[PDB]
Structures are given as C-alpha cells and as structure tokens.
Amino acid sequence: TGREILEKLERREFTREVLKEALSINDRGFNEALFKLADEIRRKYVGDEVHIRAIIEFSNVCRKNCLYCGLRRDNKNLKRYRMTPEEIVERARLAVQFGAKTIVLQSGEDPYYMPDVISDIVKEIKKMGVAVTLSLGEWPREYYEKWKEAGADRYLLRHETANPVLHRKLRPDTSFENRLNCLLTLKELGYETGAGSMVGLPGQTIDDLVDDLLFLKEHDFDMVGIGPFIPHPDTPLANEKKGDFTLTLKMVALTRILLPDSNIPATTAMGTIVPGGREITLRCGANVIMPNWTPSPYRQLYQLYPGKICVFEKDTACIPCVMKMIELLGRKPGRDWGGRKRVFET
C-alpha cells in the first residue's frame, strides 16, 4: 500500500522493492505525501536557505556527440560561440556584484580552454571570495588536478543514466565506466562532487530509475542534478517523448529522502517543461537554483534542449528574479557559499 511505502521511507528502509513501488504508484494522495515528506526532510536538514549558483555557459563548442544534446558535434544548425577569458572573468565579477556566492562555469567539451585557460579563469574568479563550480565534462585526471590546484571547489558531472548499456548507446564517445571513473577521481581530489540523471530517456525503464537512486545513495554525492529529458529537433532523438514532470519530481523527492543533507538544484529543465516547475521542485526537496548568467548574444545559442526559459530576458534579469522567487516561496537567500553541511547519522 501507499501508506506502507511511506512508512518504510520514513523508517529509512530503502530497499529496491520500496523505491520501485514509490516510483510505480500513481495515486495523487501518495504522490502529495511523498512530496510533503521530501519538503520536510529538506527543511529539517538543509533549512530554508536557497543557494544561488550563477551559471555562465561560456562556450557551446563540443567534441562529443551525445544523442540527446543540442550541442552534439554533428549539429550543423547551430552558431557556435566562445567567450574570451576576459569576458568570462568580468561577467563573473558582475554576478558577484549582484550577490552571487557561487559561480558555475559550464560548457560543451571544448578543447580550446583545456586545461590552462580554465585554470587562469578560476584563479581570477577565486580572488573575488566566492565558490567556483566547474561543469566541463570528461577530462584526464591531470586536468581535474590542475583545476583543483587553481582553486575550483566543486564539479558537476551528471551520471546521466546508471544503465551501462543505455549510457553507451546515448553517449557513443564514452561509457558509464568512464563517467563513474571521472566522478570517483573528482571525489578523490577533494571536489564537492555532483552527479544526477535525466528522467524519461528513450529506452529507460522504472527499474533504471531505481538503479539511478541506488547509485546516488551508494556514492553519497554532495550534489544531485535531476531533470526531464527534453527532445531537441536537431538531434537523433527529436521525435522521442519528453520526460514526465511528475515522475522527475518524484526522483527529486526520493533523492532528498535518500541523501537528506545533499545540495539538490531545481533545474532549468524542470522550469522549461512546466511553467513554474522550478518553484514546485524547490518545494519537493530541492534547495539550490542556477539563474542564467550567460550574456547576450550567446545565451540564445546554448541550446542543450529547446524552449529554454530566460533566453529572451535582459542579461542581468535572472539573479533579481530568483531573489524575488526565493522571497515569494517564503525562503531565504544563502548567506555563505552553500557548501554541503554533512549531518553524520546511523
């Protein structure tokens, strides 16, 4: 029964059997109770602060060919861009002037910057007294070491799917084994490390989602980024179905329940598939948001998926907008860098 599954989640009996049933039950009452549980666990462990991570998507050049992604190298219907290191540093400075306590640098897997230009950029931003999070994909250990020495604090590297067969199909340049080895190296080097997956990929099952949750629990990641798959018209997956918002929201809720002290963003993909999706997600376990800080005229060219919200807004709009969002949600802005605050338990 739904009531029995909630009782087991409340007692932290996180068996495969319990997680599968939670994801399989579609009862509105059960779902609402699950979201309430996750919301309460979030409030108890990580409080009411919503941590703002200002994201600068500094290049849409990519060497990889992921089947879901609009930046895949085979996509010729996309104007490619690269911000200069001076542009990136000064754009980061502007975010810090607007109150950002974490700068996130994200790109396609663009060889041009790697590793030294990134190191130089990271060193300049670290002078501003903020946390730096990188999201640059898969690189050699030596690059990750150099970036950590340069001052990088965190690394976001979504594991995408924990099914190694699906992973290899969707990401033909690499493997789940590679992705996991990247994540383990990041952890070893002392990064606060973020993983997470997409929900509703072509061929992905409920059992795969259960494996995603068990994988996250196993490795105790500091951050978990979860969003729905959104098909992009300039990719091989163009005609496939979008991920379901409510199922994806259940994955966020379960992630909070399993990893109560983790940092969990309300992802832009959630706000893209449903108007107000990020706000809902912030009320179902999430405690982080990433306002878009990519400048014009490049913001519109960073199209991992279509319809992406905030593309049409003035450059500087998203930090003020999320501060208003945080207030109308009855939440507080983060006071410090919002690093993980571990609660050791049993």
Q: Does 182 count as an annotated binding residue?
A: no
Q: Does 310 count as an annotated binding residue?
A: yes
Q: Rounded CA gap, 186 and 260, in Å?
A: 21
The closest alpha carbon to 9, from 346, 285, 253, 342, belongs to 253
Question: Number of helices (H) and strands (E), helices first, in the chain?
Answer: 13, 10
The interface with Cl ion within residues 211-240 (CB under 5 A) comprises 225, 227
Region of 94-102, 246-254, 266-274, 294-302 interacting with Cl ion (CB under 5 A):
266-274
Q: Rounded CA gap, 201 and 170, in Å?
A: 9
CB of 201 to ligand SAH, least distance (A): 9
Phi, psi at 3, each rounded to 5°: -60, -40
Q: Does 318 count as an annotated binding residue?
A: yes
Which amino acid, 1?
A: T
Region of 60-68, 250-258, 266-274, 325-333 interacting with ligand SF4 (CB under 6 A):
60-68
Q: Rounded CA gap, 151 and 297, in Å?
A: 29
Q: Which CB atom, from 189 or from 274, has the smaller least distance to ligand FES?
A: 274
> Residue holding tokens 């340049």?
173
Q: Other C-beta atoms within 10 Å of 230: how many?
A: 20
Q: Rounded CA gap, 80 and 61, in Å?
A: 6
CB of 33 to ligand FES, least distance (A): 29
Tell me: does residue 69 bind ligand SF4 (CB under 6 A): yes
CB of 269 to ligand FES, least distance (A): 14
Tell me: does residue 108 bind ligand SF4 (CB under 6 A): yes
Binding partner of residue 305 among ligand SF4, Cl ion, ligand SAH, none, CB cut-off 5 to 8 Å per kind:
ligand SAH
Contact 248, 199 (CB under 8 A): yes
Using CB under 6 A, list all residues that contact ligand SAH: 68-69, 106, 108-109, 135, 137, 157-158, 160, 198, 227, 229-230, 232, 269, 304-305
Q: Output the known binding site for [4Fe-4S] cluster.
A: 62, 66, 69
Q: Output the known binding site.
A: 62, 66, 69, 310, 318, 321
